[PDB]
Design a protein around this ligand. Sequence first.
Ligand SMILES: [Fe+3]
Ligand SMILES: [Fe+3]
Ligand SMILES: [Fe+3]
Lengths: 200, 200, 200, 200, 237, 237, 236
Amino acid sequence: PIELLPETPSQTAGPYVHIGLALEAAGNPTRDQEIWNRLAKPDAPGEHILLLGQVYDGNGHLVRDSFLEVWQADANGEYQDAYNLENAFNSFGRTATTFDAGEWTLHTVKPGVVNNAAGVPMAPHINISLFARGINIHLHTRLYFDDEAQANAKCPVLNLIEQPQRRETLIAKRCEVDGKTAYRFDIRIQGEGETVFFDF
Amino acid sequence: PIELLPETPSQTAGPYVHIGLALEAAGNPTRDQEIWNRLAKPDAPGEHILLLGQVYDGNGHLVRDSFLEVWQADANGEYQDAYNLENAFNSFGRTATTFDAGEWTLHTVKPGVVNNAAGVPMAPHINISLFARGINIHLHTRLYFDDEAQANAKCPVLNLIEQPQRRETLIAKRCEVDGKTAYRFDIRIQGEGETVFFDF
Amino acid sequence: PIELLPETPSQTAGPYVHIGLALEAAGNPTRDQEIWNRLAKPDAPGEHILLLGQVYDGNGHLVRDSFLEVWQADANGEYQDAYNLENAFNSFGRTATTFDAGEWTLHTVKPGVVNNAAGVPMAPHINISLFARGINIHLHTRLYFDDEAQANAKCPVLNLIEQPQRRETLIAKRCEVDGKTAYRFDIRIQGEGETVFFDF
Amino acid sequence: PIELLPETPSQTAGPYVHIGLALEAAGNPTRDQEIWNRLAKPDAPGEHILLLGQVYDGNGHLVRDSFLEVWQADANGEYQDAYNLENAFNSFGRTATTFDAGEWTLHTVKPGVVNNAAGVPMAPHINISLFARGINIHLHTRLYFDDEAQANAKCPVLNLIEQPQRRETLIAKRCEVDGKTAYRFDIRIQGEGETVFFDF
Amino acid sequence: PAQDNSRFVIRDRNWHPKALTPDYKTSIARSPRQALVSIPQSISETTGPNFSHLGFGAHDHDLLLNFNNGGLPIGERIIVAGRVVDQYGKPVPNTLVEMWQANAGGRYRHKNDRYLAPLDPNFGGVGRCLTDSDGYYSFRTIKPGPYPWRNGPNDWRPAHIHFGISGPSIATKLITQLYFEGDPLIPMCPIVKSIANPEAVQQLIAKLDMNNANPMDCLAYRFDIVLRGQRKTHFEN
Amino acid sequence: PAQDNSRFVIRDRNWHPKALTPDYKTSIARSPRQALVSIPQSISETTGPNFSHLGFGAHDHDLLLNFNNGGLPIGERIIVAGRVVDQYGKPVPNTLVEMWQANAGGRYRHKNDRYLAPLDPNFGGVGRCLTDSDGYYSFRTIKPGPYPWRNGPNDWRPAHIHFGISGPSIATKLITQLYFEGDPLIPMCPIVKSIANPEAVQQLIAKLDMNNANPMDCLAYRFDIVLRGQRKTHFEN
Amino acid sequence: PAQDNSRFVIRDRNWHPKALTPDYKTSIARSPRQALVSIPQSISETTGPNFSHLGFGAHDHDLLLNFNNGGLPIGERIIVAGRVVDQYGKPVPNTLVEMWQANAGGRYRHKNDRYLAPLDPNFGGVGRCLTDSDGYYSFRTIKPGPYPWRNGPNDWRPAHIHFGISGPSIATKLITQLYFEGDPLIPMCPIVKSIANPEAVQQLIAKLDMNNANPMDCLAYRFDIVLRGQRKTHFE
Ligand SMILES: [Fe+3]
Ligand SMILES: [Fe+3]
Ligand SMILES: [Fe+3]
């Protein structure tokens, strides 16, 4: 068969990933421009939300050295790839769990609906890639919202998860933090309540 | 050492096993004669019973595409191998779980006692072979009966299972279905309450 | 793919084939029973015929060391495989061309119609195999009759010969020899008028 | 020595070439635009002519499945390579022999004189490529005209054919079809009168 | 009734695929985590059904004719034939061989198959037969197509026919899959690769069999099946 | 109008099949017995049609859609794609690639084909396209079946697609046949074997191309085509 | 205004390291036990950030100058350079390449690293670059030292530099580690050996590149990166 050049293989990010990719979270000096966890300035259109979560290993213990990358549509359901710290909104961000702060946070807006390649709407979601010591190749997941039940029930990606019970692992829980709308999305890498991870 | 011709290797039966081995269960038209789940004609000797059960995977979720073959002595402890739809009793049958009917059923008689090769009586039992998508080589088990406690305690096959708690996985529970004597035999392929599986 | 034992390869019969297979034609003493050119005793049913012919090489010169084997149905369209010199008719015979007698002869009856494997009638024919010095593997042909024009036109074997002109090479010419019905069938191995040879 | 990438090897076009390259000739439905046998619109410059011919195998039998491609200068000696069904003249066309129409036809104009690479005029000619079942790599030839005898005698390509008698195989015969000027160009692939075929 | 008169050679469960083969994703949750419990052969294991008295239809072995809705199925006409023997080389006569497959496009006639390749109105995909007195079986069918399946993001089954063979006891019963000589999908398939030993994989590949072909009609493939060796009991009790 | 500005590398007629290849029986009477006459390249040979202005239909390259009589064809859905280059490795852009084939069962939609395998009412078997500015072409089709033919008493063509490629001149024009990776019929075919050099045969075998497949939809095969090398004229006259 | 116009060749997850690789002890509890769920590519997966207008500092790619506290760092001066291409051999221009590493003695500038090898007051260990229009990147740094880690009782990482590459979409994003030609620690490392195929391990070993060296100044190593092949959608 046709064999292309093989892809460079993945390796774990390791315990010090933060010195290269999360300088502030590492307690080290930052450069003038950093890619971080504030996707939306206050003036950006749409519903402003706080996302937060904790990451658990297979023994139910906190992962305190996680690094997370997120990719989401704007409130109007468009992906904004031209990354610029002057933008009111950027579709891409980074966050982390650390020893000081075991709970990651993101400041964003709720993403609008986007269609799949066959033109069927997907429920509002945030794409997440999870890196850490012990993770040899990053894990892909999606964060959906518990107040989009009707859309979630019809999502063609959610519906590829064979068991309903496993679908529940991707649904973030609405709450309020300091009077502001927030959603909690905990990730369990292994075992009871194991979060659905994707290949694509 | 002496090496014989190798056996043809097993492969999973896959998700469409019913089109070949359970045509009625597949909702496809049947041929004039099919090997199915009614072992006993109404006037066959012995105690007429219903067997039924569900099959669970390692996540506790129903296996909705399993295919089962059974082999049992008749009520007089004889194996009737000359398969024939005109027989009052066939020792062999087939059943299945499907999307519509997640619970398999078998109509038979309670089997009589047979001796092992050393002449020791075995407790009444049904030999079962389980096939499905995800099962690379079929799993062997035995269904024994909870109202044969004295015989079960003395069975030389049950006594080969080192732990009493695992012996309990092979004991079907007496119940009533539509007012008729029945025994329920659930199979757990993996994890908590995992059913004992045999090699011979 | 599946490969069977290979067939023993053919070799030419060579110039002295007659000492082994045509003893009389070789001018050598015969044994008590020989397989030769009289397929029909006078009492055999059907139309008694003389067949004769000459064999030509690619330069138009006579082949004077040919050996021919023939196989034909009886007048009723049945092949008689139980070869016996006491039979009124045998379906099999042998003839030859020699230096003394360049023209072979056969004494037979006109064969009846036989169907092909799909049940379609073939026109009356004699199967012929030709052997000689210079012929590494024998050549198969058929002799048909010029007074069976209607049957010949519909023969499914004749009709596999793509060109009408080549079909004419297999049609023997009726004549009279000493007041008796005869047919002449000359074979041209190579070049102008080349006789159709078959593979099967 | 310097060895380039090898050319993809030729294979016969086979008996069903018309379904791909001569759809109307195959009696199958045509697409909106097909490359076929009318090179000249009625108002194209030059002398409008019909070309036609038959193709013979080595046994003198008609080739009833041939496919032909032609390439010729226009009447002013120009090769019109921008193929377009709206052109007054196309230098390229296709034609075929079939079971129904054993004689190919081409509607064109008489081509004007073009010079060879050394600047010597070639006699008016049509370049022809012949494909068919049994032809493993297509055969190149040229059709010249019998009423251009002076030019033909001086053609540097015709003069590369060592024997005058073989030069005669490339000269089409002027005739009339339905009262119109025509030239007949029969091709004999093999044997007596074998048409000259070119390599370049 | 059946008697305990024979013993079957123990299975090599490193020649067969193991239960847990994670690249085949459905095996991860449908594989036992405890060891199998070994038990001695008794009459329960060394006997099994014989199907000599099962009534077979005329076309049960002929998939070109057994789903006839006004015409022939579309696809590559093939005979699939072979012999069933045990590990000692003894033929296994009068044994039930069942088979099922997709159509020429990789579509199964099952409600759960939603692949966009069309059903063939003259093809059902199911056959059975009994081996003859010398162990030989034969079916006539069309060659099934590969098809995509939700394992990895671009996984395709090689063309295959599912087989089930009864043999002389429940100890011999086997389900497997036949694949076709030279199919470049075979080395890439996680179900094929559930078999760790490449020599064992080779045993599932049917060979083109020109000798059994019907000229101008259908090709043929040969697939021989080996069941557990059967011997008489000796020196017991 | 066209100009004489290039020369084409001379063909290796021991790499191509020779004319007389008697095992392929129809070649015996359709092969010239006289030598070909070599002639120098002129404008007549170094020019040829360009089909940039030919009007192609929407589905001309898509055999799954271009014979649509109410449904999809039955059979193995495949993309057949590749690149056309010359012997110097230069892409050949805007060139005409035409193809035809049998259906999934080895039956052609031609009156002369009487093979008993049925026609597919949604399959015609004909495609064309122009290579893009980088030399690439693609078709979507179903994989054709082998079929029997009246050569030897049990001869079968391997599965194949017929191709015709124009290239930059009449000197480059080529007709060939594409075969499929691993088909055990390829070594047995007298038409394949008209090519004496086994390395040349390999150049006609399309490779399975999982990278170009559409998951859950169609597989893909890659077939690259090399036409005669083109160079500028130099030091002439 | 990102659009779905491309598909990416599916990953070979037997070429990459598997999740569960027990000799690398931390993978035992941080590996999913359920199968990954395959999903079709959509605009969500086939797009991603472009960092063309991220504002880079003058020394962001030069680790000999980007932690300047009065002198040069101690250690082997090297240039680390290469090309980022996809599996079709197409270069990947204007893509973000980030890297981090320990100092010459195997010590990282992170509070959780308490290895007794000292920090270097003129070294920080962090770089970033965008590939140029032909897919090339380059950093200047010091060769990192190996270092011990609490896996087995005497386990040591080979000298290595951590790398992250964005590529054209979130589907191509990759984190990996670069190792150095000839290092005898490479075959012993359970993190290297998380990669089962030895030919894949070879793809992470940077080669000494004398052609790129500055005589009398610094050596150079070459590390080419291949991301997933990108093709146009067809017949969807
Ligand atoms: Fe299947
Ligand atoms: Fe063909
Ligand atoms: Fe490190």
